[PDB]
């Protein structure tokens, strides 16, 4: 009659409850499905126990190691980037920075050590955009430029990306200038801000520096190179000639 006396869940949602040790006609009575006077009836067997035979992890050993220093990138494909622009969720007229990529839901709600642009669906991408990511594959750099766009791979960290979405740090695709000449130019830009904005860090390790110092990856530090110089901080391009 009453609505509260007529509500229920779908019948398929309900499943039989098995109360063991409540008679023989229930099917789970005397022994409750344990057998007859064994270790599995009296006590408990360890989960890793195989009766005494040595496990394979010991006979063969554990192979390899788990890399604890490897960066975790948020993979982004051109197939998905195009779908977001056609839907009006990413304005292509403005620069597509990490702040606009995370707040768009294209890489999910999880922020990671970086964002890498992959080249899935590179043959159907013909939108000129100005994107700035942490990394990009060779197949995506040519597809972004074939359509008339610009791509720059900057250096980011997990804390740097969070501050970008939080507005605590302004985005910039240029490294911090070094030298006494630029000290004022930069200090003046900070005073006009009238707000505390954190700086984006720059690569300090040998690898990360070399990654963004080469033109292959469209690194933001490639300018610091000469046409004949190599990105490596140690190796050099040998000279070929009679000696």
């Amino acid at each position: 009659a009453s609505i509260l006396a007529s509500l229920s869940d779908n019948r398929g949602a309900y499943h039989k409850r098995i109360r063991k040790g409540r008679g023989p006609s229930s099917g789970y009575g005397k022994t409750a499905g344990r057998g007859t006077k064994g270790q599995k009836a009296h006590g408990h067997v360890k989960p890793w126990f195989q009766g005494g035979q040595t496990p394979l992890i010991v006979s063969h050993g554990r192979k390899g190691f788990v890399n604890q220093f490897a960066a975790d990138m948020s993979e982004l494909n051109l197939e998905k980037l195009q779908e977001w622009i056609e839907a009006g969720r990413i304005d292509p007229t403005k620069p597509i920075t990490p702040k606009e990529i995370i707040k768009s839901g294209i890489i999910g709600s999880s922020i990671k050590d970086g964002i890498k642009l992959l080249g899935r669906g590179k043959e159907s991408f013909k939108i000129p955009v100005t994107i700035t990511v942490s990394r990009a594959s060779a197949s995506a750099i040519e597809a972004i430029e074939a359509a008339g766009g610009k791509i720059v791979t900057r250096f980011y960290t997990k804390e740097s990306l969070k501050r970008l979405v939080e507005g605590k740090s302004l985005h910039t695709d240029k490294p911090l200038p070094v030298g006494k000449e630029h000290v004022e130019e930069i200090l003046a830009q900070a005073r006009s801000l009238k707000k505390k904005y954190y700086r984006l860090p720059d690569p300090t390790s040998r690898w990360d520096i070399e990654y963004y110092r080469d033109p292959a990856h469209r690194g933001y530090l490639s300018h610091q190179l000469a046409p004949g110089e190599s990105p490596s901080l140690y190796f050099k391009v040998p000279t070929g000639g009679e000696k």
């Binding site: 609505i3 509260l4 007529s6 509500l7 229920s8 869940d9 779908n10 949602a13």
Partner: peptide, 9 residues
């Protein structure tokens, strides 16, 4: 939906 109303009550 009786099921949905049921789950909220």
């Amino acid at each position: 939906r009786r099921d949905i109303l049921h789950l909220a009550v």
